[PDB]
Amino acid sequence: HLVCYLCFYGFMAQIRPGESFITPYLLGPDKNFTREQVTNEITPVLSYSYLAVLVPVFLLTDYLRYTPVLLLQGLSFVSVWLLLLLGHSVAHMQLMELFYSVTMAARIAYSSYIFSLVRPARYQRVAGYSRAAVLLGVFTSSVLGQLLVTVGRVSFSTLNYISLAFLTFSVVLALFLKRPKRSLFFNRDDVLARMLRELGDSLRRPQLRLWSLWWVFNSAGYYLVVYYVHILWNEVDPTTNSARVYNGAADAASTLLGAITSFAAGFVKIRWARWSKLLIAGVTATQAGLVFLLAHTRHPSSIWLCYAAFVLFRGSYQFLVPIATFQIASSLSKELCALVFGVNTFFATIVKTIITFIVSDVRGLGLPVRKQFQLYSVYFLILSIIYFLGAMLDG
């Protein structure tokens, strides 16, 4: 029973009921944080910490094999939810953001875990099972959070206790099995023309230099919007009642829409790529027009548009991720694709850090959330214009 335990662990490692209400919890009658404090001081710390931990942790997952890294991720989640409940300062919340960044950086280990674990000629079925288990766990997480906030009238303090119980159970389940080999990088048994004539021949491809730049810049913008969105739903509707906050429902709907849209972008990935710049232009223009709707909504009774303009914003980004991944990793080996997808992520985080320092940090411009979203919409518009001009030049 090896395949059954990996799916059980993939499901019961995503629960964390109350990950969608962290921002309402900080901006509430318990922590008593102000929106300026939260945004400008606490949220930039996520990006710097993400860069700082991301650079080491990719090499510490190869060397140690994935079991120590998954244990570290579980303990980091436990630390995050211990700093959430216990803590009343800003430095405590910045430590919380450092640990959360550690979790995000280590979140890139389960796929390689499974790949090196299963066995060939069995890898695809087990990978498909585990990719479905993780999505179901994430969906059930938000559905349980929203059903425990609204239907059952518990406060935001008890959600964190339930989350802590689930996290402890996950760390207990985090024992699982370890390898004698990785076959990637360090724990091999023993090239790719040194993987160097390899990535040279790889970079000599028009379709690999087109989706990598998309990856970098559009992922930077996407993650900025995702990070700062929850501080904008509080500006619109400052409700002190924890029974009319639908962050969990919004995230559950976003997860369903992303899974529907990624399945739909499985037919048009070998076709519909002769116009791989008209697609990017259209989707980026839609994303630019949705962040404008987010930034131009002020009435407290029009919050249904802010919840629904984020669901479509995440759904439109998950359309091109399967298409970008297939075109980037099409003539690559398995050892070089993992390096290319890490180089793209590092460069996206560099841009995120630069923009965050310039705009959001108090040692930069220090702008409120609405002005930040205006600048983000302008950013997406510029990318859409550039891509449309390139596509027109193609014809």
From Swiss-Prot:
Keyword Phosphoprotein in record: yes
Region (Required for substrate-binding): 348-360
Location of this chain's protein in the cell: Cell membrane; Apical cell membrane; Basolateral cell membrane
Effect of residue 22 to A: Reduces methotrexate uptake. Reduces methotrexate uptake
Effect on the protein upon substituting residue 318 to A: Reduces methotrexate uptake. Reduces IRF3 phosphorylation upon cGAMP stimulation
TM stretches of this protein: 4-24, 39-61, 66-86, 91-113, 128-152, 158-176, 208-233, 246-268, 275-295, 302-325, 340-363, 372-395
Effect of residue 314 to A: Reduces methotrexate uptake
Positions with a binding annotation for folate: 22-23, 97, 107, 138, 222-223, 227, 314, 318
Membrane topology qualifier: Multi-pass membrane protein
Comment on protein domains: Has separate binding pockets for folates and cyclic dinucleotides. Two cyclic dinucleotides can be accommodated in the binding pocket and they are likely transported at the same time.
Name of this chain's protein: Reduced folate transporter
Upper lineage: Eukaryota, Metazoa, Chordata, Craniata, Vertebrata
Gene: SLC19A1
Boundaries of the shown chain within the full protein: 27 to 454 of 591
